[PDB]
Amino acid sequence: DELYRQSLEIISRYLREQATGAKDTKPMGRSGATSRKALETLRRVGDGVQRNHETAFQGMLRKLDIKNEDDVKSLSRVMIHVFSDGVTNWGRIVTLISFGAFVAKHLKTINQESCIEPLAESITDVLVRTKRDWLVKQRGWDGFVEFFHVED
């Protein structure tokens, strides 16, 4: 539905921009203001995650040795497994997307840039299928933006 489209748009845009360093110039779809704020939030908060945990993220990438649209399936099982302790929070969600960006960058450097598309799809599926009820209860991307808002 709309939550799926909005999520895939936000996550795809973030991962592609992280991999290429190019901001997409085209307009967002419905609920564009929330999506633009979600992207601002991912840029800002995802930077803190990736820099605080860069060494660990590097080691994770080495472990997985992702080089094919199929190692991404292994990553999907890992990402679902994150939530198997029954704990959900916005920190875990931003962290998964941040690790996704770290992987997207690696995929570009090894010349598999089109795999950023199935990568974005797999991360989106964890939020909008696996954790749909929590996402909706927490107000979706508006809740995400509010959780990470910068105080005056």
Add this chain to the structure above:
Amino acid sequence: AIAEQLRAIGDAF
């Protein structure tokens, strides 16, 4: 263990 590391970082965040 990747999932444990991702969980930890998400709970701190």
